[PDB]
Design an enzyme around this catalytic site. Structure first.
Site, short mmCIF file in Angstrom:
data_model
loop_
_atom_site.label_atom_id
_atom_site.label_comp_id
_atom_site.label_asym_id
_atom_site.label_seq_id
_atom_site.Cartn_x
_atom_site.Cartn_y
_atom_site.Cartn_z
CB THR A 109 -0.96 -0.05 1.12
OG1 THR A 109 -0.32 -0.41 2.42
CG2 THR A 109 -2.12 -0.67 1.00
CB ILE B 125 1.50 -4.55 -5.92
CG1 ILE B 125 2.94 -4.23 -4.78
CG2 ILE B 125 1.45 -3.72 -6.95
CD1 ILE B 125 4.23 -4.10 -5.57
CG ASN B 126 -1.60 -8.02 -0.55
OD1 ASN B 126 -1.61 -7.18 0.53
ND2 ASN B 126 -1.90 -9.20 -0.56
CG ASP C 215 -5.24 -8.30 0.82
OD1 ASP C 215 -4.69 -8.81 1.73
OD2 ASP C 215 -5.46 -7.02 0.45
CB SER D 191 -6.62 -2.52 5.56
OG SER D 191 -6.78 -3.86 6.05
N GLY E 61 -1.12 -2.39 5.81
CA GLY E 61 -1.75 -3.72 5.80
C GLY E 61 -2.96 -3.32 7.06
CL LIG Z 1 2.50 5.21 1.84
#
Ligand SMILES: [Cl-]
Ligand SMILES: *[C@@H]1O[C@H](CO)[C@@H](O)[C@H](O)[C@H]1NC(C)=O
Ligand SMILES: *[C@@H]1O[C@H](CO)[C@@H](O)[C@H](O)[C@H]1NC(C)=O
Ligand SMILES: *[C@@H]1O[C@H](CO)[C@@H](O)[C@H](O)[C@H]1NC(C)=O
Ligand SMILES: *[C@@H]1O[C@H](CO)[C@@H](O)[C@H](O)[C@H]1NC(C)=O
Ligand SMILES: *[C@@H]1O[C@H](CO)[C@@H](O)[C@H](O)[C@H]1NC(C)=O
Ligand SMILES: *[C@@H]1O[C@H](CO)[C@@H](O)[C@H](O)[C@H]1NC(C)=O
Ligand SMILES: N[C@@H](CCC(=O)O)C(=O)O
Ligand SMILES: [Cl-]
Ligand code: NA
EC number: 3.4.19.13
Lengths: 189, 342
Positions: A1, A20-21, A43, A72, A94
């Site tokens: 994130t 991109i997780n 996710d 999230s 996360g």
């Molecule tokens: Cl950031």
């Protein structure tokens, strides 16, 4: 994130969170295009994967074709009754994104911390399971004590909790802050 | 102290060079959306571990003329061939082609720019194409991420090709160049978003994902659509309104946390002594616990009916009911908060 916040001179604003997780996503980079591909499928919940001791999978978040996994992320814009933007805020990191965004808002709106302090102020996190409160290294230890005497189990974050970028309207214009935890700085005119 | 106050406009990104690129876009007459896109393209380089054109995003956008907010949903979607039982371990769901969802990033930029752009599309890419070719010193964030994942990076030659110097991950301050991505950005700048989804980049994207064990197909890319949400989630907080995305993002969780807490009327006095401050932070943690109890019912609202769940999560009355169960002198076991899966 990654989160970024923008306010233009006419008062319009963008709060954008992109991902991109996990770090480096799927770890698949194209040798031709250089694109680094997400691992966003992680996710989703899956019937066969247990991530936390004693925690069941969540059927609302199972994989279907064409479905988007729960996130999230929470890019936010706060606007005053007069139509002017008050705050542009969001976070990366996360599961702690949502709590960190809440904290930045609480810190600025209610505690009266200026935007840079609201961003730099120590954070804490609890997501019910695991059954522990994580606190950053430099939190007021009177808070740690107040949590522990109320039967919270606390643990200190090995690194840091989330990353917040924010802009707030002030009498002087637009005050901006990027989070030292990841190394950003804002720019404007 | 490290304050930054601007009389006209501001960009807060997670790397100074990207904030500057956004700011220059504004100064050149770009909209907030133009600036956001230009800065995002740069963050995809400078913090490439975090985001980029291989991922997806949400934008919350406010137009000060109409006084309306909207959300653009460009999060990745499960490919057409995906299915509920496709992974049997966390590792399978996290590494390799099968872990890849269909990227939404570039179609998100496209939709946002169609609705709110002022500068030409190619102008948004130009600074990042230069930066990717010139290279830049690795910053604090990327450096720590490289260290964290040094093993996987160093063992994967296609990653080490760019993220290593002499077979070991780059360290803070060392120059990172991203020459292939620079050319990809140039292609996107000239040919448009269509290049990614149904054009000159598409076959190679599919080849790359499938070669790594994935199942994304050209049809997946061709069919991907970013979505306009005209009515984002909101809550009232005093005299203000907070706009945030609903499910599948975590707006409902944020809303519930804040609505629980607003009933305590926090102020500067809430943190003025250890006693007040301790209770205040306890209350915050308890609000987090209640909010996360409810989060497990959420999912993509196109596939799961979350209407009533979100209604409760954004209701002040429901929040008051939870606030009343927060005990000032103690936390509680998990079951107390009534986590729910159905
Ligand atoms: Cl950031
Ligand atoms: C997990 O097991 C199911 C059931 O046999 C199978 O369909 C699926 O392909 C497996 N996934 C992997 C990645 O091996
Ligand atoms: C904001 O709304 C006005 C009024 O409809 C419109 O003319 C303008 O193009 C919008 N601005 C952007 C950047 O979308
Ligand atoms: C472009 O899309 C059309 C239909 O949408 C399809 O027939 C064609 O194969 C696509 N081309 C690429 C390169 O994906
Ligand atoms: C907030 O609540 C809903 C959002 O769909 C709507 O009825 C209401 O108009 C919204 N308020 C604002 C100020 O957008
Ligand atoms: C919403 O909250 C009420 C209590 O205020 C509860 O009775 C109801 O079951 C909740 N709805 C859902 C879908 O959980
Ligand atoms: C969680 O922590 C609380 C607080 O000490 C405790 O009462 C409870 O037994 C713990 N375990 C569970 C399963 O809730
Ligand atoms: N990619 C991590 C999220 O969307 O929450
Ligand atoms: Cl590259
Ligand atoms: Na600052």
């Amino acid at each position: 994130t990654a989160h970024l916040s923008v306010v233009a001179e006419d008062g319009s604003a963008v709060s954008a969170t992109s991902t991109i997780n996990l770090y480096f996503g799927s770890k698949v980079r194209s040798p031709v295009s250089g694109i680094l591909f997400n691992n966003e499928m992680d996710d989703f919940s899956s019937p066969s994967i247990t991530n936390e001791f004693g925690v069941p999978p969540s059927p609302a978040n199972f994989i279907q074709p064409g479905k988007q996994p729960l996130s999230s992320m929470c890019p936010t814009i706060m606007v005053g009754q007069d139509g002017q933007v008050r705050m542009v805020v969001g976070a990366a990191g996360g599961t702690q994104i949502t709590t960190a965004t809440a904290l930045a808002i609480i810190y600025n709106l209610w505690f009266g911390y200026d935007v840079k302090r609201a961003v730099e102020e120590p954070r804490l996190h609890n997501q019910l399971l695991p059954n522990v409160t994580t606190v950053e290294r430099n939190i007021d230890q009177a808070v740690t004590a107040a949590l522990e005497t109320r039967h919270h189990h606390t643990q200190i974050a090995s690194t840091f909790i989330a990353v917040v970028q924010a802009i707030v309207r002030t009498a002087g214009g637009w005050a901006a802050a990027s989070d030292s935890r990841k190394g950003g700085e804002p720019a404007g005119y | 102290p490290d304050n930054h106050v601007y009389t006209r406009a501001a960009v807060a990104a997670d790397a100074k060079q990207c904030s500057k690129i956004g700011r220059d876009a504004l100064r050149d007459g770009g909209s907030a959306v133009d600036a956001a896109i230009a800065a995002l393209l740069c963050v995809g380089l400078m913090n490439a571990h975090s985001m980029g054109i291989g991922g997806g995003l949400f934008l919350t956008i406010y137009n000060s003329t109409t006084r309306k907010a909207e959300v653009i949903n460009a999060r990745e979607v499960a490919p057409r061939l995906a299915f509920a039982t496709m992974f049997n371990s966390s590792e399978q769901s996290q590494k390799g082609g099968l872990s890849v969802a269909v990227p939404g990033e570039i179609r998100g930029y496209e939709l946002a720019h169609q609705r709110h752009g002022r500068l030409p599309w190619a102008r948004l890419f130009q600074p990042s194409i230069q930066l990717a070719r010139q290279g830049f010193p690795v910053g604090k964030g990327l450096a720590a991420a490289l260290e964290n994942k040094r093993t996987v990076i160093e063992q994967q030659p296609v990653l080490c090709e760019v993220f290593c110097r002499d077979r070991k991950v780059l360290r803070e301050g060392e120059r990172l160049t991203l020459p292939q991505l620079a050319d990809t950005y140039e292609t996107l700048a000239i040919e448009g978003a269509q290049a990614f989804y149904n054009g000159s980049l598409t076959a190679q994207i599919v080849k790359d994902i499938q070669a790594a064990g994935g199942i994304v197909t050209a049809e997946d890319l061709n069919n991907y659509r970013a979505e306009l949400i005209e009515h984002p989630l909101n809550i009232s907080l005093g005299d203000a309104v907070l706009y945030m995305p609903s499910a599948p993002l975590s707006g409902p969780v944020l809303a519930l946390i804040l609505n629980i807490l607003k009933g305590y009327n926090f102020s500067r006095e809430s943190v003025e002594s250890p006693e007040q401050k301790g209770l205040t932070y306890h209350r915050i943690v308890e609000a987090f616990r209640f909010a996360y109890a409810k989060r497990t019912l959420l999912g993509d609202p196109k596939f799961v009916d979350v209407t009533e769940v979100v209604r409760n999560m954004t209701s002040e009355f429901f929040a008051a009911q939870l606030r009343a169960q927060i005990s000032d002198d103690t936390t509680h076991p998990i079951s107390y908060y009534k986590p729910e899966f159905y």
